[PDB]
Design a protein around this nucleic acid. Structure first.
Ligand SMILES: [Zn+2]
Ligand SMILES: [Zn+2]
Lengths: 193, 56
RNA sequence: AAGGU
């Protein structure tokens, strides 16, 4: 009785797409019956189909478990370092799904909204791994409401075709070295004044 | 001002950390274009339809 | 046109 109840962005909302409002990508895409509101101002950007997991390649089950971990760390390092040039990066999420709307999706949330707009203006004219980079603003705010809950513990029975984010987490050593390196880069660009 | 003091206390704290702008990326795949596309920009390649997304 | 409130 303290506040009115709403259904906006929920699965019960029959005009707004709940999956696009939370996860930033719907299985129907532009043919969906519900609205996909593309934000003009946002902190999170989306690079669809950027991470090509070698496991889903013809010659990509020849690598061992240790080699696969170092290859993903080289990708996560290559992403966080390049995205850091557009401002402060708060979180970097890489999707390990197989659905055409979430396969290899890369979400990056900046601290400032202007940092995200300057990123999509530059990424849409660059390349990565012999492929043009697609960049757009994503309405994703909280990744906890978009990640698969049954995937954090054990594995999701739906497999790679899950409509929620199956985020592939990097090594804790790299994630810690990236946060410490970003604060050092920001602290160095502060003693100038 | 204490702002300058709060920076020097962090820089001396982060003495054995390399800043992100000086990370030596050994195998970075950025700006690598496919053979023949040296004169084709990223915008012209997406509109050509040779590099479509898995949705389309 | 669903599993997510
Ligand atoms: Zn939708
Ligand atoms: Zn799942």
């Amino acid at each position: 009785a303290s506040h009115l109840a709403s259904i906006y962005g929920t699965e019960q909302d029959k005009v707004n797409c709940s999956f696009y409002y939370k996860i930033g990508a719907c299985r129907h895409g532009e043919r969906c019956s519900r609205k996909h509101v593309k934000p003009n101002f946002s902190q999170t950007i989306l690079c669809p189909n950027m991470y090509k997991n070698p496991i889903h390649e013809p010659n990509g089950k020849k690598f061992t478990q240790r080699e696969l971990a170092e290859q993903f760390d080289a990708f996560y390092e290559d992403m966080f370092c390049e995205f850091s040039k557009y401002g402060e990066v708060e979180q970097l999420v890489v999707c390990d799904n197989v659905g055409d709307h979430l396969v290899g999706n890369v979400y990056v949330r900046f601290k400032y909204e202007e940092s995200a707009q300057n990123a999509i203006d530059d990424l849409n004219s660059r390349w990565y791994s012999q492929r043009p980079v697609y960049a757009e603003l994503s309405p994703v705010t909280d990744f906890r409401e978009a990640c698969c809950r049954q995937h954090e513990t054990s594995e999701c029975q739906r497999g790679g075709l899950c409509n929620f984010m199956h985020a592939k987490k990097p090594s804790p050593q790299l994630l810690r070295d990236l946060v410490l390196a970003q604060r050092k880069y920001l602290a160095l660009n502060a003693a100038e004044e | 001002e204490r702002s300058v003091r709060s920076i020097e206390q962090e820089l001396e704290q982060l003495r054995d950390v390399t800043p992100i702008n000086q990370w030596k990326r050994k195998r970075s795949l950025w700006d690598i274009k496919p053979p023949g596309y040296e004169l084709v920009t990223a915008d012209q390649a997406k509109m050509s339809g040779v590099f479509p997304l898995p949705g389309a």
